[PDB]
């Protein structure tokens, strides 16, 4: 009867984007089209990411400029993580599960494949649950802020601190063993921190492909976000929030 009264996590559970497909089984397996498809697929997921974002309780109350900044700051974190989680669940941290119709064995993407597979195995190692994953993924949306601060900053930190407690409750709803909980919080939030370092190695490759491009097809949504962030990343206007400072 009071299972009717929804928690914040059951809410996060029902707004998770639906699976998307590369549209991919012409047939030859070339660099250009695989990269191009991944570009096109990353567009749709960023697009997904936004609808998702705009459903996260608290994300609404923040300023529109505050909403844009966070998505342009976190978009690569959300994909890196999501990919990890899927590769974790579909193939025990061993394969790179972009979509059902696109399962990439190692093979270019060395730095990428390595770093991406790390995330996945860490999820596999910790054996993260779905509620855990949901809270953790929302936290990644709130992973970085402008150094000059968000307009709705005071509000931002209120909401972010709320979603930590939720990842807390996810651990508690999982078991509540002992100091086992403490240790789990430690290891989970540590993983979130490593995300900062992983996304950087992924964000550069992405720029290098975007700029050094030679020819390669890119969607509107990514192009903008990319072109718009390069000067933000380049000038140091970003402040990476970490759990273990």
């Amino acid at each position: 009867l009071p299972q009717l009264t929804p928690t914040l996590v059951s809410l996060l559970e029902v707004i998770e984007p639906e699976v998307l497909y590369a549209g991919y089984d012409s047939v030859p397996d070339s660099t250009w089209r695989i990269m191009t498809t991944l570009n096109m697929l990353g567009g749709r997921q960023v697009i997904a990411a936004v609808k998702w974002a705009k459903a996260i309780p608290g994300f609404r109350n923040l300023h529109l400029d505050d909403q844009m900044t966070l998505l342009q700051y976190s978009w690569m974190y959300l994909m890196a993580f999501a990919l990890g989680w899927r590769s974790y669940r579909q193939s025990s941290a061993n394969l790179l599960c972009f979509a059902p119709d696109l399962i990439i064995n190692e093979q270019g993407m060395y730095d990428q494949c390595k770093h991406m597979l790390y995330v996945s195995s860490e999820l596999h190692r910790l054996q993260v649950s779905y509620e855990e994953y949901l809270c953790m993924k929302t936290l990644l949306l709130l992973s970085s802020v402008p150094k000059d601060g968000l307009k709705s900053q005071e509000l931002f930190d209120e909401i972010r601190m709320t979603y930590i407690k939720e990842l807390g409750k996810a651990i508690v709803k999982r078991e509540g063993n002992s100091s086992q909980n403490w240790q789990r919080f430690y290891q989970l939030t540590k993983l979130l921190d490593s995300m900062h370092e992983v996304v950087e190695n992924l964000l550069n490759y992405c720029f290098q492909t975007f700029l050094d491009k030679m020819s390669i097809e890119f969607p509107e949504m990514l192009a903008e976000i990319i072109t718009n962030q390069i000067p933000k990343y380049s000038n140091g206007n970003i402040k990476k929030l970490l759990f273990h400072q």
Partner: peptide, 9 residues
């Protein structure tokens, strides 16, 4: 702008 419109839907 592209992102902007999408957030303002």
């Amino acid at each position: 702008a592209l992102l902007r419109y999408l957030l303002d839907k």
